[PDB]
Design a protein around this nucleic acid. Structure first.
Lengths: 136, 52, 191
RNA sequence: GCAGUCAAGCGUUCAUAGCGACAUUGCUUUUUGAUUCUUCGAUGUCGGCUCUUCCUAUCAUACCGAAGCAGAAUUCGGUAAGCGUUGGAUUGUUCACCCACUAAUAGGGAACGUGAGCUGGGUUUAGACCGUCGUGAGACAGGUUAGUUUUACCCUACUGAU
Protein backbone atom coordinates (compact mmCIF):
# COMPACT_ATOMS: atom_id res chain seq x y z
CA UNK A 1 0.00 0.00 0.00
CA UNK A 2 1.15 3.52 0.83
CA UNK A 3 0.85 6.85 -0.91
CA UNK A 4 0.36 6.51 -4.66
CA UNK A 5 -0.58 2.81 -4.41
CA UNK A 6 -4.04 3.09 -5.95
CA UNK A 7 -6.38 0.19 -5.38
CA UNK A 8 -6.07 -2.45 -2.67
CA UNK A 9 -4.15 -5.70 -2.22
CA UNK A 10 -5.35 -8.89 -0.56
CA UNK A 11 -3.16 -9.92 2.36
CA UNK A 12 -0.53 -12.60 1.71
CA UNK A 13 2.19 -14.34 3.69
CA UNK A 14 4.87 -12.03 5.10
CA UNK A 15 8.27 -13.45 4.16
CA UNK A 16 10.63 -10.47 4.10
CA UNK A 17 11.36 -8.99 7.54
CA UNK A 18 13.66 -6.07 8.31
CA UNK A 19 17.21 -7.04 7.37
CA UNK A 20 16.57 -9.21 4.31
CA UNK A 21 18.69 -9.15 1.16
CA UNK A 22 16.90 -9.08 -2.20
CA UNK A 23 18.27 -9.52 -5.71
CA UNK A 24 18.10 -6.44 -7.91
CA UNK A 25 15.43 -7.16 -10.52
CA UNK A 26 15.76 -4.00 -12.64
CA UNK A 27 18.61 -2.53 -14.69
CA UNK A 28 19.47 0.24 -12.24
CA UNK A 29 23.06 -0.97 -11.78
CA UNK A 30 22.49 -2.34 -8.28
CA UNK A 31 23.08 -5.98 -7.35
CA UNK A 32 21.20 -6.40 -4.05
CA UNK A 33 18.95 -4.47 -1.68
CA UNK A 34 18.86 -4.42 2.13
CA UNK A 35 15.36 -3.88 3.53
CA UNK A 36 15.29 -1.46 6.47
CA UNK A 37 11.52 -0.98 6.95
CA UNK A 38 8.13 -1.54 5.32
CA UNK A 39 5.32 0.93 4.68
CA UNK A 40 2.04 0.67 6.57
CA UNK A 41 3.40 -1.69 9.22
CA UNK A 42 2.08 -2.35 12.72
CA UNK A 43 3.31 -1.72 16.26
CA UNK A 44 4.11 -4.77 18.40
CA UNK A 45 6.98 -5.42 20.79
CA UNK A 46 9.69 -7.59 19.22
CA UNK A 47 8.16 -7.94 15.76
CA UNK A 48 10.16 -7.26 12.61
CA UNK A 49 8.08 -5.24 10.12
CA UNK A 50 7.88 -7.66 7.21
CA UNK A 51 7.29 -7.17 3.49
CA UNK A 52 5.48 -9.17 0.81
CA UNK A 53 4.72 -9.23 -2.91
CA UNK A 54 3.74 -5.89 -4.44
CA UNK A 55 4.67 -4.00 -1.27
CA UNK A 56 6.87 -0.90 -1.44
CA UNK A 57 9.84 -0.66 0.92
CA UNK A 58 13.02 1.38 1.23
CA UNK A 59 16.27 -0.56 0.93
CA UNK A 60 19.91 0.46 0.70
CA UNK A 61 22.31 -1.08 -1.83
CA UNK A 62 24.92 -2.98 0.17
CA UNK A 63 26.64 -4.07 -3.08
CA UNK A 64 26.36 -2.06 -6.29
CA UNK A 65 27.52 0.79 -8.44
CA UNK A 66 28.95 3.37 -6.06
CA UNK A 67 26.69 6.42 -5.70
CA UNK A 68 23.68 4.13 -5.19
CA UNK A 69 25.15 3.38 -1.73
CA UNK A 70 25.29 5.12 1.66
CA UNK A 71 21.72 6.39 1.27
CA UNK A 72 18.10 5.26 1.64
CA UNK A 73 15.95 4.71 -1.45
CA UNK A 74 12.47 3.15 -1.78
CA UNK A 75 11.83 -0.01 -3.77
CA UNK A 76 8.98 -2.30 -4.82
CA UNK A 77 8.89 -6.08 -4.32
CA UNK A 78 8.40 -8.14 -7.48
CA UNK A 79 9.19 -11.64 -6.15
CA UNK A 80 8.71 -13.24 -2.74
CA UNK A 81 10.06 -16.83 -2.93
CA UNK A 82 7.66 -17.62 -0.06
CA UNK A 83 4.51 -19.72 -0.42
CA UNK A 84 1.43 -17.48 -0.35
CA UNK A 85 -2.19 -18.41 -1.00
CA UNK A 86 -4.26 -16.68 -3.67
CA UNK A 87 -8.04 -16.39 -3.50
CA UNK A 88 -8.36 -18.78 -6.46
CA UNK A 89 -6.88 -21.53 -4.28
CA UNK A 90 -3.23 -21.85 -5.30
CA UNK A 91 -0.16 -21.95 -3.03
CA UNK A 92 2.64 -20.56 -5.20
CA UNK A 93 6.12 -19.13 -4.73
CA UNK A 94 9.08 -17.89 -6.76
CA UNK A 95 12.67 -19.08 -7.02
CA UNK A 96 14.28 -16.09 -5.29
CA UNK A 97 13.63 -12.62 -3.92
CA UNK A 98 13.72 -9.62 -6.25
CA UNK A 99 13.01 -5.92 -5.95
CA UNK A 100 12.96 -2.89 -8.23
CA UNK A 101 14.12 0.66 -7.50
CA UNK A 102 11.30 3.21 -7.29
CA UNK A 103 10.91 6.72 -5.92
CA UNK A 104 7.99 7.36 -3.53
CA UNK A 105 5.74 8.70 -6.31
CA UNK A 106 5.71 5.13 -7.68
CA UNK A 107 7.66 5.28 -10.94
CA UNK A 108 10.86 3.34 -11.57
CA UNK A 109 14.39 4.67 -11.97
CA UNK A 110 15.25 1.64 -14.10
CA UNK A 111 14.28 0.85 -17.68
CA UNK A 112 13.55 -2.90 -17.83
CA UNK A 113 12.92 -5.85 -15.51
CA UNK A 114 14.54 -9.29 -15.81
CA UNK A 115 12.64 -12.38 -14.74
CA UNK A 116 9.03 -13.12 -13.80
CA UNK A 117 7.02 -10.41 -12.02
CA UNK A 118 4.09 -11.27 -9.76
CA UNK A 119 0.80 -9.92 -11.08
CA UNK A 120 -0.12 -8.97 -7.51
CA UNK A 121 2.61 -6.33 -8.00
CA UNK A 122 1.73 -5.41 -11.59
CA UNK A 123 -1.92 -4.77 -10.69
CA UNK A 124 -1.22 -2.75 -7.54
CA UNK A 125 1.53 -0.60 -9.07
CA UNK A 126 0.71 0.56 -12.62
CA UNK A 127 4.21 1.80 -13.45
CA UNK A 128 5.76 -1.51 -12.40
CA UNK A 129 3.45 -3.25 -14.87
CA UNK A 130 4.45 -0.60 -17.41
CA UNK A 131 8.10 -1.65 -17.12
CA UNK A 132 7.42 -5.29 -16.21
CA UNK A 133 8.49 -8.33 -18.20
CA UNK A 134 7.13 -11.81 -17.58
CA UNK A 135 3.86 -11.58 -15.66
CA UNK A 136 3.65 -14.73 -13.51
CA UNK B 1 -24.82 34.59 -5.45
CA UNK B 2 -24.36 36.39 -2.13
CA UNK B 3 -27.84 37.85 -1.35
CA UNK B 4 -26.67 39.70 1.80
CA UNK B 5 -30.28 40.06 3.00
CA UNK B 6 -30.05 36.59 4.58
CA UNK B 7 -26.39 37.04 5.58
CA UNK B 8 -27.49 39.35 8.39
CA UNK B 9 -29.93 36.55 9.33
CA UNK B 10 -27.48 33.65 8.92
CA UNK B 11 -24.79 35.53 10.85
CA UNK B 12 -27.34 36.29 13.58
CA UNK B 13 -26.78 32.80 15.03
CA UNK B 14 -23.18 32.18 13.88
CA UNK B 15 -21.10 35.34 14.41
CA UNK B 16 -23.15 37.81 16.47
CA UNK B 17 -22.18 36.21 19.79
CA UNK B 18 -19.70 36.56 22.66
CA UNK B 19 -17.05 34.16 23.95
CA UNK B 20 -15.75 33.65 27.48
CA UNK B 21 -11.97 33.74 27.29
CA UNK B 22 -11.35 30.97 29.84
CA UNK B 23 -13.86 28.30 28.79
CA UNK B 24 -14.11 29.32 25.09
CA UNK B 25 -17.89 28.91 24.90
CA UNK B 26 -20.53 30.66 22.79
CA UNK B 27 -22.56 33.23 24.74
CA UNK B 28 -25.31 35.68 23.79
CA UNK B 29 -23.98 39.09 22.70
CA UNK B 30 -25.67 40.87 25.63
CA UNK B 31 -24.83 38.23 28.26
CA UNK B 32 -23.13 39.62 31.35
CA UNK B 33 -21.76 36.27 32.61
CA UNK B 34 -21.09 32.74 31.36
CA UNK B 35 -23.75 30.09 31.93
CA UNK B 36 -21.25 27.23 32.30
CA UNK B 37 -19.80 26.18 35.66
CA UNK B 38 -16.29 25.03 34.68
CA UNK B 39 -15.23 28.63 34.07
CA UNK B 40 -17.20 29.79 37.12
CA UNK B 41 -19.74 32.29 35.72
CA UNK B 42 -17.01 34.70 34.65
CA UNK B 43 -17.44 38.44 34.10
CA UNK B 44 -15.04 38.89 31.18
CA UNK B 45 -16.30 37.86 27.74
CA UNK B 46 -14.69 38.59 24.44
CA UNK B 47 -16.77 39.36 21.34
CA UNK B 48 -16.44 36.89 18.49
CA UNK B 49 -13.89 38.12 15.98
CA UNK B 50 -15.34 39.22 12.64
CA UNK B 51 -14.28 37.83 9.26
CA UNK B 52 -10.94 39.06 7.87
CA UNK C 1 -36.48 36.67 51.22
CA UNK C 2 -39.39 34.21 51.63
CA UNK C 3 -41.98 36.23 49.74
CA UNK C 4 -45.33 35.96 51.52
CA UNK C 5 -47.42 35.96 48.32
CA UNK C 6 -46.91 36.60 44.61
CA UNK C 7 -49.64 36.62 41.97
CA UNK C 8 -50.22 36.69 38.22
CA UNK C 9 -53.46 37.17 36.30
CA UNK C 10 -54.34 34.99 33.30
CA UNK C 11 -56.87 36.39 30.83
CA UNK C 12 -59.15 33.85 29.13
CA UNK C 13 -60.55 34.87 25.72
CA UNK C 14 -64.20 34.07 25.12
CA UNK C 15 -63.34 31.72 22.24
CA UNK C 16 -61.55 29.15 24.42
CA UNK C 17 -61.94 27.53 27.84
CA UNK C 18 -59.38 26.15 30.28
CA UNK C 19 -59.83 23.22 32.67
CA UNK C 20 -57.92 22.93 35.96
CA UNK C 21 -57.51 19.71 37.97
CA UNK C 22 -54.98 20.01 40.81
CA UNK C 23 -51.94 20.83 38.64
CA UNK C 24 -53.15 19.37 35.33
CA UNK C 25 -54.22 22.05 32.84
CA UNK C 26 -56.19 21.58 29.62
CA UNK C 27 -57.34 24.23 27.15
CA UNK C 28 -60.22 23.74 24.70
CA UNK C 29 -60.48 26.03 21.69
CA UNK C 30 -61.53 26.27 18.04
CA UNK C 31 -58.08 25.25 16.81
CA UNK C 32 -57.81 22.20 19.06
CA UNK C 33 -57.06 21.02 22.59
CA UNK C 34 -53.75 20.80 24.45
CA UNK C 35 -52.96 19.46 27.93
CA UNK C 36 -49.87 20.04 30.06
CA UNK C 37 -48.85 18.61 33.44
CA UNK C 38 -47.48 21.24 35.84
CA UNK C 39 -46.95 19.08 38.93
CA UNK C 40 -43.18 19.73 38.87
CA UNK C 41 -43.42 23.41 39.87
CA UNK C 42 -45.75 23.41 42.95
CA UNK C 43 -47.94 26.40 42.11
CA UNK C 44 -51.51 27.24 43.15
CA UNK C 45 -54.45 28.17 40.91
CA UNK C 46 -57.74 29.95 41.55
CA UNK C 47 -60.74 30.90 39.40
CA UNK C 48 -62.45 34.19 40.31
CA UNK C 49 -64.16 35.78 37.27
CA UNK C 50 -64.28 32.92 34.72
CA UNK C 51 -62.12 34.91 32.29
CA UNK C 52 -59.53 35.52 35.04
CA UNK C 53 -57.41 32.79 36.63
CA UNK C 54 -55.05 33.82 39.43
CA UNK C 55 -51.82 31.96 40.21
CA UNK C 56 -50.45 32.24 43.73
CA UNK C 57 -47.49 31.02 45.78
CA UNK C 58 -47.34 31.29 49.57
CA UNK C 59 -44.02 31.52 51.44
CA UNK C 60 -41.95 30.94 48.31
CA UNK C 61 -38.32 31.91 47.91
CA UNK C 62 -36.76 34.05 45.22
CA UNK C 63 -35.89 31.08 43.00
CA UNK C 64 -39.35 29.53 43.46
CA UNK C 65 -41.08 32.87 42.76
CA UNK C 66 -39.14 33.03 39.48
CA UNK C 67 -40.98 29.81 38.57
CA UNK C 68 -44.33 31.47 39.32
CA UNK C 69 -44.05 33.84 36.35
CA UNK C 70 -42.95 31.12 33.93
CA UNK C 71 -46.07 29.12 34.86
CA UNK C 72 -48.18 32.05 33.68
CA UNK C 73 -45.94 32.47 30.63
CA UNK C 74 -46.35 28.91 29.36
CA UNK C 75 -50.08 28.81 30.11
CA UNK C 76 -50.64 32.13 28.35
CA UNK C 77 -48.26 31.13 25.55
CA UNK C 78 -50.32 28.01 24.78
CA UNK C 79 -53.54 30.03 25.11
CA UNK C 80 -52.52 31.82 21.92
CA UNK C 81 -51.54 28.42 20.54
CA UNK C 82 -55.09 27.12 20.90
CA UNK C 83 -56.61 30.51 20.02
CA UNK C 84 -54.34 31.95 17.31
CA UNK C 85 -51.92 29.14 16.42
CA UNK C 86 -48.19 29.38 15.79
CA UNK C 87 -46.38 29.73 12.45
CA UNK C 88 -42.57 29.66 12.21
CA UNK C 89 -40.86 30.48 8.91
CA UNK C 90 -37.37 29.37 7.86
CA UNK C 91 -35.20 30.51 4.98
CA UNK C 92 -32.56 28.48 3.15
CA UNK C 93 -29.07 30.01 3.05
CA UNK C 94 -26.44 28.67 0.66
CA UNK C 95 -23.50 29.92 -1.38
CA UNK C 96 -22.89 27.42 -4.20
CA UNK C 97 -24.90 24.28 -3.41
CA UNK C 98 -28.71 24.54 -3.60
CA UNK C 99 -30.47 22.78 -0.72
CA UNK C 100 -33.44 20.52 -1.45
CA UNK C 101 -35.91 20.16 1.44
CA UNK C 102 -39.04 18.03 1.07
CA UNK C 103 -41.52 16.03 3.14
CA UNK C 104 -41.34 12.23 2.87
CA UNK C 105 -43.60 9.69 4.57
CA UNK C 106 -41.86 6.42 5.49
CA UNK C 107 -44.15 4.06 7.45
CA UNK C 108 -46.07 7.04 8.82
CA UNK C 109 -43.04 8.93 10.13
CA UNK C 110 -43.41 12.29 8.31
CA UNK C 111 -39.67 12.72 7.83
CA UNK C 112 -38.32 16.02 6.50
CA UNK C 113 -35.72 15.13 3.87
CA UNK C 114 -32.72 17.41 3.28
CA UNK C 115 -30.66 16.79 0.14
CA UNK C 116 -27.49 18.29 -1.33
CA UNK C 117 -26.71 20.38 1.76
CA UNK C 118 -23.10 21.53 1.29
CA UNK C 119 -22.90 18.86 -1.40
CA UNK C 120 -23.12 16.17 1.28
CA UNK C 121 -24.15 12.76 -0.03
CA UNK C 122 -25.53 11.78 3.38
CA UNK C 123 -29.28 12.13 3.80
CA UNK C 124 -30.85 14.10 6.65
CA UNK C 125 -34.29 13.25 8.02
CA UNK C 126 -36.16 15.13 10.75
CA UNK C 127 -39.41 13.73 12.19
CA UNK C 128 -42.57 15.83 12.27
CA UNK C 129 -44.21 15.78 15.69
CA UNK C 130 -47.90 15.59 16.56
CA UNK C 131 -50.04 18.64 15.85
CA UNK C 132 -47.43 20.40 13.68
CA UNK C 133 -47.70 20.71 9.90
CA UNK C 134 -45.15 22.00 7.39
CA UNK C 135 -46.01 24.10 4.34
CA UNK C 136 -44.11 26.06 1.69
CA UNK C 137 -44.14 29.83 1.32
CA UNK C 138 -46.12 31.39 -1.52
CA UNK C 139 -44.15 32.92 -4.44
CA UNK C 140 -41.00 33.22 -2.30
CA UNK C 141 -38.08 30.96 -3.17
CA UNK C 142 -36.61 28.58 -0.59
CA UNK C 143 -38.76 29.33 2.46
CA UNK C 144 -40.47 26.63 4.53
CA UNK C 145 -43.32 27.35 6.95
CA UNK C 146 -43.96 25.29 10.10
CA UNK C 147 -47.64 25.52 11.10
CA UNK C 148 -48.68 24.01 14.43
CA UNK C 149 -51.07 24.48 17.32
CA UNK C 150 -48.46 23.84 20.03
CA UNK C 151 -45.70 25.98 21.54
CA UNK C 152 -42.86 23.64 22.47
CA UNK C 153 -43.67 20.98 19.87
CA UNK C 154 -43.49 23.46 16.99
CA UNK C 155 -40.47 25.35 18.33
CA UNK C 156 -38.51 22.18 19.16
CA UNK C 157 -39.32 20.76 15.73
CA UNK C 158 -38.21 24.13 14.37
CA UNK C 159 -34.86 23.96 16.18
CA UNK C 160 -34.41 20.28 15.28
CA UNK C 161 -34.45 21.12 11.56
CA UNK C 162 -32.05 24.02 12.14
CA UNK C 163 -29.57 21.88 14.10
CA UNK C 164 -29.69 19.01 11.60
CA UNK C 165 -27.85 21.29 9.14
CA UNK C 166 -24.43 21.89 10.68
CA UNK C 167 -20.96 22.46 9.25
CA UNK C 168 -18.29 19.91 10.20
CA UNK C 169 -14.60 20.89 10.44
CA UNK C 170 -14.88 24.22 8.61
CA UNK C 171 -14.97 27.94 9.36
CA UNK C 172 -18.40 28.88 10.70
CA UNK C 173 -17.89 32.61 10.08
CA UNK C 174 -17.23 31.96 6.36
CA UNK C 175 -19.69 29.20 5.37
CA UNK C 176 -22.91 30.95 6.38
CA UNK C 177 -25.09 28.34 4.67
CA UNK C 178 -27.64 26.14 6.41
CA UNK C 179 -31.15 26.82 7.71
CA UNK C 180 -32.28 29.39 10.28
CA UNK C 181 -35.36 30.90 11.90
CA UNK C 182 -36.60 33.91 9.91
CA UNK C 183 -39.87 34.95 11.59
CA UNK C 184 -41.73 33.80 14.72
CA UNK C 185 -45.34 34.46 13.75
CA UNK C 186 -48.85 33.22 14.45
CA UNK C 187 -51.23 31.15 12.33
CA UNK C 188 -53.82 33.94 12.25
CA UNK C 189 -52.84 36.30 9.44
CA UNK C 190 -54.45 39.32 11.12
CA UNK C 191 -52.87 38.49 14.49
C1' G D 1 8.53 19.62 37.43
C1' C D 2 3.46 21.48 37.04
C1' A D 3 -0.88 25.01 37.47
C1' G D 4 -3.06 30.10 38.30
C1' U D 5 -4.09 35.49 39.29
C1' C D 6 -2.56 40.69 38.08
C1' A D 7 -0.61 43.12 34.12
C1' A D 8 3.34 47.20 31.33
C1' G D 9 4.11 45.61 26.54
C1' C D 10 4.75 42.07 21.72
C1' G D 11 1.41 40.66 18.42
C1' U D 12 0.91 46.23 11.43
C1' U D 13 -3.21 49.02 13.72
C1' C D 14 -5.59 45.45 19.53
C1' A D 15 -4.07 43.26 26.92
C1' U D 16 -5.30 38.56 26.96
C1' A D 17 -6.07 34.59 18.55
C1' G D 18 -1.45 33.36 20.56
C1' C D 19 2.38 35.28 23.97
C1' G D 20 3.79 38.13 27.86
C1' A D 21 7.98 41.49 31.63
C1' C D 22 8.18 43.35 37.37
C1' A D 23 5.84 40.87 41.22
C1' U D 24 2.66 37.09 43.51
C1' U D 25 -0.62 32.21 45.08
C1' G D 26 -0.44 27.05 45.16
C1' C D 27 0.02 21.77 43.47
C1' U D 28 3.17 17.38 42.72
C1' U D 29 6.51 13.09 45.58
C1' U D 30 8.82 9.76 39.20
C1' U D 31 14.73 14.90 40.31
C1' U D 32 18.04 16.25 43.77
C1' G D 33 18.58 17.75 48.67
C1' A D 34 18.00 17.85 54.32
C1' U D 35 16.49 14.75 58.50
C1' U D 36 17.77 10.05 60.51
C1' C D 37 12.41 7.42 62.71
C1' U D 38 12.24 1.41 61.10
C1' U D 39 16.08 -2.46 59.77
C1' C D 40 23.51 -3.82 60.68
C1' G D 41 21.53 -12.29 65.21
C1' A D 42 21.74 -9.52 58.46
C1' U D 43 13.96 -7.54 54.24
C1' G D 44 19.72 -9.75 48.00
C1' U D 45 22.28 -3.37 45.55
C1' C D 46 22.17 -0.72 38.81
C1' G D 47 20.44 -2.06 34.29
C1' G D 48 18.21 -5.19 30.41
C1' C D 49 14.34 -9.43 28.88
C1' U D 50 9.02 -11.23 30.45
C1' C D 51 4.30 -9.92 32.48
C1' U D 52 -0.20 -7.67 35.05
C1' U D 53 -2.74 -3.67 36.77
C1' C D 54 -3.41 1.30 38.14
C1' C D 55 -3.08 7.20 37.58
C1' U D 56 -3.19 11.17 34.45
C1' A D 57 -0.85 17.00 34.01
C1' U D 58 -4.14 13.20 26.30
C1' C D 59 0.92 11.72 22.05
C1' A D 60 -2.82 9.32 18.47
C1' U D 61 -8.11 7.73 17.98
C1' A D 62 -14.18 9.64 19.55
C1' C D 63 -17.33 14.11 20.00
C1' C D 64 -17.06 19.61 20.42
C1' G D 65 -15.65 24.97 21.20
C1' A D 66 -11.66 29.54 19.66
C1' A D 67 -8.24 31.83 16.09
C1' G D 68 -4.62 37.15 13.21
C1' C D 69 -9.54 29.12 11.38
C1' A D 70 -11.31 31.54 3.17
C1' G D 71 -9.71 25.54 1.94
C1' A D 72 -5.30 22.46 3.48
C1' A D 73 -2.08 22.47 7.30
C1' U D 74 -1.76 24.36 12.26
C1' U D 75 -2.35 26.41 17.11
C1' C D 76 -5.30 26.91 22.19
C1' G D 77 -8.99 24.51 25.22
C1' G D 78 -13.42 20.87 27.28
C1' U D 79 -15.64 15.35 28.64
C1' A D 80 -12.60 11.71 28.31
C1' A D 81 -7.50 6.41 29.22
C1' G D 82 -12.18 2.73 26.42
C1' C D 83 -8.16 1.52 23.10
C1' G D 84 -3.09 2.02 20.99
C1' U D 85 2.03 4.13 22.10
C1' U D 86 7.16 0.56 17.56
C1' G D 87 11.56 -1.64 14.94
C1' G D 88 17.19 -0.60 14.95
C1' A D 89 22.85 1.44 15.03
C1' U D 90 26.25 3.40 19.94
C1' U D 91 26.64 2.69 25.09
C1' G D 92 26.04 -1.90 30.97
C1' U D 93 23.77 1.86 30.60
C1' U D 94 19.16 5.36 33.79
C1' C D 95 19.80 9.12 30.45
C1' A D 96 21.03 10.88 25.58
C1' C D 97 21.70 11.39 20.12
C1' C D 98 20.52 9.63 15.36
C1' C D 99 18.08 5.98 11.16
C1' A D 100 12.97 4.45 9.84
C1' C D 101 7.99 3.24 9.97
C1' U D 102 3.47 4.79 11.92
C1' A D 103 -2.60 7.61 13.59
C1' A D 104 1.19 8.38 17.56
C1' U D 105 5.91 6.86 18.74
C1' A D 106 2.80 10.91 26.09
C1' G D 107 4.51 11.02 31.03
C1' G D 108 4.48 7.90 35.12
C1' G D 109 3.48 4.50 40.02
C1' A D 110 3.03 -0.39 42.18
C1' A D 111 9.63 -1.81 48.38
C1' C D 112 13.37 4.01 42.49
C1' G D 113 7.02 -3.10 40.43
C1' U D 114 9.44 -7.58 38.90
C1' G D 115 16.87 -12.31 40.70
C1' A D 116 13.55 -19.25 45.60
C1' G D 117 11.25 -15.17 37.13
C1' C D 118 16.03 -14.93 34.01
C1' U D 119 21.20 -12.49 32.66
C1' G D 120 25.70 -10.90 35.28
C1' G D 121 27.05 -6.32 30.93
C1' G D 122 28.46 -2.28 35.49
C1' U D 123 29.46 -0.92 40.28
C1' U D 124 31.59 -4.09 44.72
C1' U D 125 36.22 -8.99 47.99
C1' A D 126 40.35 -11.73 46.47
C1' G D 127 44.74 -12.19 40.51
C1' A D 128 46.98 -8.62 37.28
C1' C D 129 48.43 -4.00 33.95
C1' C D 130 49.06 1.68 33.07
C1' G D 131 48.95 7.05 34.89
C1' U D 132 49.16 10.43 39.41
C1' C D 133 50.36 10.51 44.73
C1' G D 134 53.62 8.17 48.89
C1' U D 135 60.53 6.98 50.89
C1' G D 136 57.62 2.84 51.69
C1' A D 137 53.46 -1.00 52.72
C1' G D 138 49.75 1.12 49.80
C1' A D 139 45.54 5.26 47.97
C1' C D 140 42.62 7.06 43.52
C1' A D 141 33.91 8.77 41.27
C1' G D 142 40.84 7.02 37.71
C1' G D 143 41.22 3.61 32.72
C1' U D 144 41.29 -2.15 31.41
C1' U D 145 41.07 -7.65 31.61
C1' A D 146 39.25 -12.58 34.53
C1' G D 147 36.10 -13.20 38.18
C1' U D 148 31.27 -20.44 42.07
C1' U D 149 25.03 -16.34 42.50
C1' U D 150 21.66 -21.97 46.36
C1' U D 151 16.31 -24.27 48.57
C1' A D 152 9.57 -24.53 47.99
C1' C D 153 8.35 -31.76 49.40
C1' C D 154 4.83 -25.85 53.67
C1' C D 155 0.40 -21.84 54.35
C1' U D 156 -2.20 -18.18 51.82
C1' A D 157 -3.05 -15.93 46.87
C1' C D 158 -3.80 -17.38 41.77
C1' U D 159 -4.60 -21.27 37.61
C1' G D 160 -7.43 -26.01 36.75
C1' A D 161 -9.95 -30.78 39.30
C1' U D 162 -12.85 -33.86 42.79
Amino acid sequence: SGNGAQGTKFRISLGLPVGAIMNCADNSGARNLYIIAVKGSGSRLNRLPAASLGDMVMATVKKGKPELRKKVMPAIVVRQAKSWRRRDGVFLYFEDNAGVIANPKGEMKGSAITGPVGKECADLWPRVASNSGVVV
Amino acid sequence: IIEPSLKALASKYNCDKSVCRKCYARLPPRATNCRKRKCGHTNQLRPKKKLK
Amino acid sequence: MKYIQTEQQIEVPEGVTVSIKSRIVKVVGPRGTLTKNLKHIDVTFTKVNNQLIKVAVHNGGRKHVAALRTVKSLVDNMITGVTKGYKYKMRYVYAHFPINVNIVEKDGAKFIEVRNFLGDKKIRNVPVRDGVTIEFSTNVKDEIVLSGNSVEDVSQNAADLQQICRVRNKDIRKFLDGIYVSHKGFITEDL
